[PDB]
Structures are given as C-alpha cells and as structure tokens.
Design an enzyme around this catalytic site. Structure first.
Site, short mmCIF file in Angstrom:
data_model
loop_
_atom_site.label_atom_id
_atom_site.label_comp_id
_atom_site.label_asym_id
_atom_site.label_seq_id
_atom_site.Cartn_x
_atom_site.Cartn_y
_atom_site.Cartn_z
CG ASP A 197 -1.72 1.16 1.60
OD1 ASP A 197 -2.94 1.71 0.13
OD2 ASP A 197 -1.91 1.77 2.49
CD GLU A 233 -2.33 2.58 -4.06
OE1 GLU A 233 -2.06 3.03 -2.66
OE2 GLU A 233 -3.39 2.74 -3.98
CL LIG Z 1 -3.88 -0.98 -6.27
#
Ligand SMILES: [Cl-]
Ligand SMILES: [Ca+2]
Length: 496
Positions: A197, A233
């Site tokens: 993330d 990401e």
């Molecule tokens: Cl994603």
C-alpha cells in the site's frame, strides 16, 4: 519477487474486497479452484481503528492500530484457516500490507479499534506493536502542516503525512524489524505475496530494507527458495518526480495508466477509438509487461476517487465494463487482477458521491455473509463481478492462451476490432454504432466452438452462440451494436 507464485496455468488474481475470511475460504473451494482463479488479494488483515463517524467506512482499514490479525473480516484462527483451505486447493493469498503509516494523527486516543487494543494518536503511542513517538517522521517532515503539500517534492511525498496519517520512520531498523515480523508471520501461515500500500510514499530503499528481512514461502506449499510476490501501489500518471521505474528492484508495480486509458478508449472519449489498441502495452508508454500489475478498476478509483478519474469503468457501467475486462484478459500485457465489489448507495452532489465512504454490507457494523443465489450470483449487496459469466469465462480464456502471441489483428479503422492468441483463442469486439458482420481469419483449427461470452460448453453442446471455423481458420462473426454483450470469444477448450 516478480513471480506471482500461482499454480501453473492460473493467470489472474481477484480482489475480494472487504470479504470475511470464512467466506473467502468457502469461495476458494466452491468456485475459485474449479474455475481456474490463481489467487485472492485480501483487505488488510491487521487491526485498524473503528471509525464511527461516518459509520465504519471502508477506509478505516488503511489506519492501522497494531499488527494483531483481528478485523471485521475475522480473527487470527479464521485467517489461518482461510490461507490453509485456499492453498490446499491451489488458490493463493496476497495480503494488502499497510506499512507506510499508522492512523490519522487526529483520531481520538483510547480503544476504538477492531481488536480493542489501546492507542493514542496524540502522543504517538501504539502500545500493541509497540511504537512510540520516536518511530514517526514528525522530526523529518519539513512541511508547515506536517502533511504532504507538494507532490512535486519527492522528499515531502515520503517523509510527510499522507492526508494526516502518522508516517512511520522506515529508515529505522527497529521499525523495519516490526513490519518484517508481521510480514513473516503472514508468510509462515502461507501467504504467497503482498500488495504494498502507498509505495509512492515510501523510499524504494526502505522497502528493500524490509524485504531483505523476509523468509522464503512456506515449504509445505511452495518450492524451496520461493520469494513472496511483490506488487507495489505506485500511482504514476506522467509528470511527477517519482517514477514507477524507481521501484522495479523490489517487485512489480501497479500500472494505473492501464485502466485510465482503457476507460477513455471504451467510452470513446477524447477522440479515442478501439482501432488504436493495435499496439496496446508498452507502446502506450506503460511499464514493461514483466513488471506490471494491471486492472480496469481498483477499490479506490471505482469510487470516482481520482486514480484515473472519470474515465474509470466499474460494475456500475456493466456493459462497457464486461468489454474492458474481456479486452484486458485476452491481451498478453501484464499480470491481471479482477475486481469483486459490494454495492453502496451512490449519491452524487456536484459531481461528488457523498456516500463514497460506505463500508461493506453490514448489520450494525457486522459484515454480512456472502450468499449465493440459485443462478450462482451473489446476494446481500455483494456484486461478485468474478462470478459474472462473461468475466469468469475470460479468466479461463487467459489461462488457455497463456504463452501464445498476439496475432491476427483486425480493425475497421473505427471500433470494430478482433485479435487472436496463437492457435488457442480469438476475440472480436463491436464498439461502433452499426453492426459487425464479417468473415475473419482466426488462426484456429476447424470446428464448432462455443462462444464463452454468451454461454458455456456443457457436455458436448453450447448454451450460447456457436462459431464455425472452416478448414482455413476462417469464421463468420455477426454482432449487433445493440447486443447485450457486443463481443465474442472462442478458445481451444470451448471447442466441441
Ligand atoms: Cl491497487
Ligand atoms: Ca512515508
């Protein structure tokens, strides 16, 4: 870190957004394994803050309190049970790893957490890890607000708080160690990899540092020396100081231009048309195919939350969406992730969905079970795009044609296109305002093939459209512009 670690011949992963562990375990056995799904991306399994205003938004899960495996999706036992059951049927688990930060600096201290652990944002005390004021980037950030104010400043992007979230000091070996500890706990249970993330908000080197501390995959299910699959990401449309290529040393990267551009093309906006997809891929300025993780939409951007904007195609745009996902699954570029959502009461006010925060279907905050209807669709407000015939069949298409090259491209100079994959599959699209009716070269062996978009091959027959390939690989295709699904797909395994 580049290999997904899926079973041979399983080419996609599904995001089972906000689903409970027990439901994923069942899904693996009753559907994912039999239908050829390679794996599942799960929502953050670690304890997060319980936000009551608004009422339990999906985003509370991106605000960690501790590394305890206790969330609304379930407890540790349930998580372990799910990984086991899934791996035993050859379906892999990818954990959404929330490691750049802790919660919002302005949340009230106490025990309003999914596992009841105490936390004090104010004093930066996260006693369940533990973390203290000495583990954050407070002293590092040089912005007035303590927050990221300028995306043109790379240092800022990494040492300041993203939307006020408590930024961890990832250069510290103690922090790196705590995170690796959590990740290793997951690897040993059996996970195959991770979604990192907000990678953009972390220095590539810090990520490297954490990765160096990880164990190889569980030797009960993976070959010795197996490394976890890493996909980071990184939102990289053009122009910022941070480039997605800066993360290639660590693993794959999410290619956000993919769905943004695909959406514009399918919607036929900005003078874009399907005939322009003949060189889709790196030809469009995308990262190398070997480092990409592609998708039409993700959990953030399907909410109009600008990680591609207004051109993003979602389950809400069902007709155009099936087409876009079909295109992605047939195209050899990247490693594909399919989205599986829940319905919410979308309510637009001045081009903004005032209910974009709404969490998963619930009964007083308790996540509702995924129910299965007689027709195999889901109930309880779960969309289950992964169960739509047109989508699951294209997941299978991708497995059948794996390794075959992109060939036999056709275009009418407008929005009628077709292409094959070696001698194993062929697909045709009609996105123009008139019918498509042409005899094309498919590169496929003669026979009667079931169209997998309108139906299925079931015990020697087709439940939908049948395509007839002659001895010379030619076949006629007819598609009305008013068809429910203006695309047809045939493959080696749909042949009678
Ligand atoms: Cl994603
Ligand atoms: Ca950071």
């Amino acid at each position: 870190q580049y290999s997904p670690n899926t079973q041979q011949g399983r080419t996609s992963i599904v995001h089972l957004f906000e689903w409970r562990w027990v439901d994923i375990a069942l899904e693996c056995e009753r559907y994912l394994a039999p239908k050829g799904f390679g794996g599942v991306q799960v929502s953050p399994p670690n304890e997060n803050v319980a936000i009551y205003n608004p009422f339990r938004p999906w985003w509370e899960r991106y605000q960690p309190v501790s590394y305890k495996l206790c969330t609304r999706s379930g407890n540790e036992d349930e998580f372990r049970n799910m990984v086991t059951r899934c791996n035993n049927v050859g379906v892999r688990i990818y954990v959404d790893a929330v490691i750049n930060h802790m919660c919002g600096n302005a949340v009230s201290a106490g025990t309003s957490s999914t596992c009841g652990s105490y936390f004090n944002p104010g004093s930066r005390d996260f006693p369940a890890v533990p973390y203290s004021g000495w583990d954050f980037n407070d002293g590092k950030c040089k912005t007035g607000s303590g927050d990221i104010e300028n995306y043109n400043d790379a240092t800022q992007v990494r040492d300041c708080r993203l939307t006020g979230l408590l930024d961890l000091a990832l250069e510290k070996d103690y922090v790196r160690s705590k995170i690796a500890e959590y990740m290793n706990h997951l690897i040993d249970i059996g996970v195959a990899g991770f979604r990192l993330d907000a990678s953009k908000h972390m220095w590539p080197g810090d990520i490297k540092a954490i990765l160096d501390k990880l164990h190889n995959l569980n030797s009960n299910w993976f070959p010795a020396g197996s490394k976890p699959f890493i996909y980071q990401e990184v939102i990289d449309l053009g122009g910022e100081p941070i480039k997605s290529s800066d993360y290639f040393g660590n693993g794959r990267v999410t290619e956000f231009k993919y769905g943004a551009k695909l959406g514009t093309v399918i919607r036929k906006w900005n003078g874009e048309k399907m005939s322009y997809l003949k060189n889709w891929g790196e030809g469009w300025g995308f990262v190398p195919s070997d480092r990409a993780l592609v998708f039409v939409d993700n959990h953030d951007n399907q909410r109009g939350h600008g990680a591609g904007g207004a051109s993003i195609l979602t389950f809400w745009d069902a007709r155009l969406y099936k087409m876009a996902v079909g295109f992605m699954l047939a195209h050899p570029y990247g490693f594909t992730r399919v989205m599986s959502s829940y319905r919410w009461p979308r309510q637009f006010q001045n081009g903004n969905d005032v209910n974009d925060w709404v969490g998963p279907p619930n009964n007083n905050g308790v996540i509702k079970e995924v129910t299965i209807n007689p027709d195999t669709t889901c109930g309880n407000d779960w969309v289950c795009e992964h169960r739509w015939r047109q989508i699951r069949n294209m997941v299978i298409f991708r497995n059948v044609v794996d390794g075959q090259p992109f060939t036999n491209w056709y275009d009418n100079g407008s929005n009628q296109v077709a292409f094959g994959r070696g001698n194993r599959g062929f697909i045709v699209f009609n996105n123009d305002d008139w019918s498509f009716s042409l005899t094309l070269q498919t590169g496929l062996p003669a026979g009667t093939y079931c169209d997998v978009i309108s139906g299925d091959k079931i015990n020697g027959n087709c439940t939908g459209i049948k395509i007839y390939v002659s001895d010379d690989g030619k076949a006629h295709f007819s598609i009305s512009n008013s068809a429910e699904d203006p695309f047809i797909a045939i493959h080696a395994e749909s042949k009678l």
